[PDB]
Amino acid sequence: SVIRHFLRDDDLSPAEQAEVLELAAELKKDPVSRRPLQGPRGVAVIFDKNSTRTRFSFELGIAQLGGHAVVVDSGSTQLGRDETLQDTAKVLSRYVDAIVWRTFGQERLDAMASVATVPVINALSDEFHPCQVLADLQTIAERKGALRGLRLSYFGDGANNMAHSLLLGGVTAGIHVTVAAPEGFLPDPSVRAAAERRAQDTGASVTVTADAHAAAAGADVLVTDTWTSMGQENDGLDRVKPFRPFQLNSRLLALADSDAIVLHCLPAHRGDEITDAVMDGPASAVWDEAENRLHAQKALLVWLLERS
Amino acid sequence: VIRHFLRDDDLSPAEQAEVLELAAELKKDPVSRRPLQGPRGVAVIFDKNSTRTRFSFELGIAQLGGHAVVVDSGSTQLGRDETLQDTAKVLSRYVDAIVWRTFGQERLDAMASVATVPVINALSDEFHPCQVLADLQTIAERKGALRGLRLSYFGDGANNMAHSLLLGGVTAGIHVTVAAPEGFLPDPSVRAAAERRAQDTGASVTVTADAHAAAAGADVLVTDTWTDRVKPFRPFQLNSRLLALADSDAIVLHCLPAHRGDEITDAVMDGPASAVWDEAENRLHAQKALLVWLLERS
Amino acid sequence: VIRHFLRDDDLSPAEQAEVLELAAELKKDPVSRRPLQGPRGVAVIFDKNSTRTRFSFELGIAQLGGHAVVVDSGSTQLGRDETLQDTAKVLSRYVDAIVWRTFGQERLDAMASVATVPVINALSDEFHPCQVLADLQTIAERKGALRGLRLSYFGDGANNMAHSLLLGGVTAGIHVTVAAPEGFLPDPSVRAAAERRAQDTGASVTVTADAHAAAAGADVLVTDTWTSMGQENDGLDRVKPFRPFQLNSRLLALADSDAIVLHCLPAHRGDEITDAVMDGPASAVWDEAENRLHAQKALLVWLLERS
Numbered sequence: 001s002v003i004r005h006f007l008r009d010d011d012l013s014p015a016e017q018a019e020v021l022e023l024a025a026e027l028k029k030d031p032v033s034r035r036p037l038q039g040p041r042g043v044a045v046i047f048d049k050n051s052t053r054t055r056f057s058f059e060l061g062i063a064q065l066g067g068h069a070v071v072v073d074s075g076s077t078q079l080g081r082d083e084t085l086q087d088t089a090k091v092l093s094r095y096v097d098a099i100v101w102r103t104f105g106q107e108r109l110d111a112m113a114s115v116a117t118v119p120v121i122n123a124l125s126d127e128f129h130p131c132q133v134l135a136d137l138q139t140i141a142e143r144k145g146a147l148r149g150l151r152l153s154y155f156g157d158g159a160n161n162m163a164h165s166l167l168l169g170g171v172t173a174g175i176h177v178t179v180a181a182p183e184g185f186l187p188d189p190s191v192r193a194a195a196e197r198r199a200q201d202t203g204a205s206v207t208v209t210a211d212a213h214a215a216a217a218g219a220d221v222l223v224t225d226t227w228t229s230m231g232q233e234n235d236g237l238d239r240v241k242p243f244r245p246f247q248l249n250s251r252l253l254a255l256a257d258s259d260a261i262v263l264h265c266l267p268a269h270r271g272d273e274i275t276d277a278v279m280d281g282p283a284s285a286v287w288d289e290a291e292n293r294l295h296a297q298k299a300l301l302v303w304l305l306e307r308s
Numbered sequence: 309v310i311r312h313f314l315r316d317d318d319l320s321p322a323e324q325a326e327v328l329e330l331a332a333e334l335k336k337d338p339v340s341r342r343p344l345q346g347p348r349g350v351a352v353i354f355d356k357n358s359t360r361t362r363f364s365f366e367l368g369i370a371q372l373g374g375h376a377v378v379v380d381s382g383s384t385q386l387g388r389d390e391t392l393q394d395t396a397k398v399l400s401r402y403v404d405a406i407v408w409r410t411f412g413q414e415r416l417d418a419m420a421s422v423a424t425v426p427v428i429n430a431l432s433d434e435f436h437p438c439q440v441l442a443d444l445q446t447i448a449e450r451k452g453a454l455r456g457l458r459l460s461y462f463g464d465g466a467n468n469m470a471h472s473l474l475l476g477g478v479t480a481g482i483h484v485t486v487a488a489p490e491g492f493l494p495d496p497s498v499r500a501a502a503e504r505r506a507q508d509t510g511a512s513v514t515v516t517a518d519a520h521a522a523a524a525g526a527d528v529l530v531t532d533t534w535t536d537r538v539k540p541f542r543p544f545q546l547n548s549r550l551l552a553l554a555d556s557d558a559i560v561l562h563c564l565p566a567h568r569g570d571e572i573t574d575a576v577m578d579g580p581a582s583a584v585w586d587e588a589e590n591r592l593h594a595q596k597a598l599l600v601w602l603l604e605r606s
Numbered sequence: 607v608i609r610h611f612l613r614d615d616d617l618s619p620a621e622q623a624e625v626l627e628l629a630a631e632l633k634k635d636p637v638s639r640r641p642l643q644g645p646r647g648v649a650v651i652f653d654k655n656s657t658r659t660r661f662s663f664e665l666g667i668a669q670l671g672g673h674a675v676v677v678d679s680g681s682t683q684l685g686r687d688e689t690l691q692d693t694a695k696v697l698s699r700y701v702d703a704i705v706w707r708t709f710g711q712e713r714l715d716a717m718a719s720v721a722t723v724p725v726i727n728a729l730s731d732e733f734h735p736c737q738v739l740a741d742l743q744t745i746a747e748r749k750g751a752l753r754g755l756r757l758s759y760f761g762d763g764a765n766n767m768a769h770s771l772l773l774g775g776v777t778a779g780i781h782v783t784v785a786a787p788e789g790f791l792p793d794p795s796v797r798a799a800a801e802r803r804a805q806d807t808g809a810s811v812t813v814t815a816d817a818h819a820a821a822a823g824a825d826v827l828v829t830d831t832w833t834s835m836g837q838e839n840d841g842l843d844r845v846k847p848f849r850p851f852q853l854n855s856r857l858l859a860l861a862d863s864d865a866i867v868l869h870c871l872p873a874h875r876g877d878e879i880t881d882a883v884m885d886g887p888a889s890a891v892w893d894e895a896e897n898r899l900h901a902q903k904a905l906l907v908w909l910l911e912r913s
């Protein structure tokens with residue numbers, strides 16, 4: 001069989017993504033009913049940078065599939081230094097049945113996936129966060145039912161990992177995705193083109209605008225994220241002033257549909273991209289969204305393992 | 309409705325007895341209780357690493373059928389925009405209990421008020437209540453009934469072990485004495501809490517600088533690392549001459565690591581009064597019992 | 607009556623054969639032996655980290671039904687806060703075996719002198735006996751019976767792999783040659799122990815500076831990194847003495863036509879071994895790495911039932 005990887009959201013077709021999201025709902029109801037890793041079989045979980053959500057959701061998810069996660073903080077290792085990534089991938093493929101990797105550049109994930117003989121999963125990278133968007137889609141479906149035709153708007157830095165993955169994963173689900181971002185902070189052009197092409201297949205659409213109020217009007221789902229990642233703290237830009245009109249506050253939420261929901265990949269900076277009132281209010285689905293990392297990632301692993 | 313265990317008197321006398329009974333049952337049948345079968349998760353977070361805390365909790369949780377997600381001190385520093393409150397809310401969606409080794413009690417109190425799962429103090433600046441559960445299990449299996457025994461702690465009377473031996477000890481009905489020099493005495497609100505709890509159990513609290521008087525007639529003698537900056541503590545060294553003053557069949561306890569030659573001697577710690585190895589083992593059984601008990605009440 | 611595995615000759619020839627047979631059985635049926643069901647614990651302690659040692663032991667212990675408790679070098683090093691003897695007595699109350707990667711051999715001896723459970727050397731300055739069990743399992747699955755094979759190791763002749771290939775190799779009846787430059791020769795006590803064990807098994811020990819001779823007629827060619835992290839600041843040029851001992855296509859071509867190549871990871875391609883050799887048809891390095899899992903599981907099963 002072809003070995004399947006999941007490095008970006010569009011690695012699943014629309015039909016394949018629907019299968020994974022249905023499995024995520026099934027596993028949330030019956031969390032130990034799928035045991036493909038019984039043995040236990042191993043799964044590598046490798047962190048170039050720590051993440052509470054990523055650590056807990058993957059380590060426990062793998063265990064609940066019957067497996068054993070070998071969790072590596074690569075700062076305590078000589079990854080990239082003492083041997084080639086190609087050599088590392090070949091050795092890993094002898095010990096584990098899948099490789100879960102939180103890293104920075106997408107080309108490293110690509111390299112690992114081209115030589116590993118087991119599925120490689122992007123746990124979080126500079127360019128994409130496709131596991132978070134699977135959890136987001138599960139959360140939206142839980143609240144709203146069918147994803148096809150919903151309107152989702154994302155606010156803030158339009159070129160970070162969540163903007164890119166909401167574009168790709170959202171249109172794969174048939175969602176009309178709007179990115180509201182200031183000029184200079186727009187989605188990567190190749191990602192945007194990929195999302196526009198995928199949107200043709202599902203009847204979705206891609207909109208990019210600097211008009212935050214227009215983006216909010218009529219939306220079913222409002223999303224934001226931190227305006228700055230760790231790598232961008234030293235990029236030289238004022239990363240507050242451009243984004244202030246894009247804050248997800250009560251005024252913005254009130255422009256959306258009356259039962260709109262709010263998502264935010266953690267962590268959050270209350271007072272910057274989102275306010276206390278919204279973050280902690282009745283429209284917020286942030287905690288269910290975090291919990292669904294566990295269920296959605298389990299579903300993804302089950303699906304990749306059986307196809308690989 | 310969620311119970312926490314952040315200091316020894318979070319358990320009433322009757323609840324402490326239940327936990328200690330369960331610890332004895334679990335020591336006999338270590339995989340007979342599987343409340344975390346699945347596995348269900350438990351967070352084990354170290355703001356400062358502790359190898360023996362990691363072994364006892366990580367294996368104990370596994371023997372309850374669960375899976376401990378262990379976060380070492382390197383991984384415990386919160387990145388940009390992370391917060392303790394948001395951490396507690398997220399952990400409550402992934403795990404069934406939170407075990408935390410941290411410093412100030414204020415952090416534990418905050419985690420407990422936000423989390424919707426039980427929070428356990430694995431070890432903190434002010435208290436080490438899981439060690440004292442293991443200590444009480446050790447005393448009980450060697451001496452039977454805890455009520456009315458005399459226990460003396462020697463050395464730094466201001467540290468977490470002194471506070472927990474006071475609170476956990478009087479909760480079990482034990483007459484507790486702390487022998488310590490004047491700059492190193494129990495925190496006064498802990499002392500007053502221990503004196504109050506002792507009225508309910510028939511116990512008592514004594515604080516003295518007289519190590520001789522503290523040892524005389526003692527049934528249990530306890531010490532801990534003292535950390536010259538250590539001169540005030542030398543008169544409190546738990547040595548062979550101090551042990552000679554205790555009741556017959558007295559037992560010696562020491563939460564590890566021991567620095568032989570300082571707070572305790574080779575002769576006392578390798579001698580027939582020593583229970584320090586059984587004590588260390590009982591961290592496993594007592595903490596498993598505590599977890600079983602908290603989970604069933606939460 | 608508690609058995610430890612601190613160096614390769616802690617197993618007799620017959621005992622080593624039992625462990626290697628079990629490694630082959632466990633490779634076939636990896637969850638058929640559950641001596642640690644419960645789970646029972648096993649300590650896996652690193653004074654210096656080894657992620658590859660971590661993968662193989664953590665998963666191997668789990669597949670025996672147990673739970674590995676892993677301690678990395680980010681905690682207070684064992685022996686600093688309390689005696690190693692006190693540490694062994696406490697660990698013995700929590701776990702059924704102690705797996706430890708440390709530095710000098712005296713530390714392993716100290717822990718094993720007191721522990722009431724088996725102590726296993728995961729990797730040390732002087733020996734790497736678990737890697738050589740994996741190597742012997744690999745050689746056996748590629749070549750059959752080990753007795754009488756000719757194995758040559760090239761490079762730093764006084765490191766842990768050179769010492770363990772000597773001891774573990776002659777225990778299996780393999781004729782072992784170490785090809786190394788002057789100043790980098792096997793420890794004399796290890797060589798003498800290997801020579802004595804070789805008299806029981808029909809094996810032999812050869813130490814030579816002639817790489818061509820070492821390679822000629824060899825069934826197995828082995829190398830390792832020329833320098834450990836601890837050696838980077840020892841003051842020596844640790845490249846120029848070893849260039850004649852590079853395991854390259856020229857050198858491989860002198861060996862038997864069916865020769866295989868081993869290298870415990872990681873490899874520094876272009877130094878001790880070339881890309882052509884690493885990635886060519888004689889290389890068994892990836893099976894070798896996999897067999898760390900199986901050989902260490904067999905060792906654990908065997909030690910637990912003897913203790």
Ligand SMILES: N#Cc1ccc(O)cc1F
Binds near residue numbers: 351353379384386
């Ligand atoms: N995982 C990560 C992490 C860091 C700090 C903390 O207090 C808790 C955690 F789960």
Ligand SMILES: N#Cc1ccc(O)cc1F
Binds near residue numbers: 074078079080
């Ligand atoms: N870092 C991570 C990691 C995982 C497996 C391995 O063989 C080496 C590594 F550095």
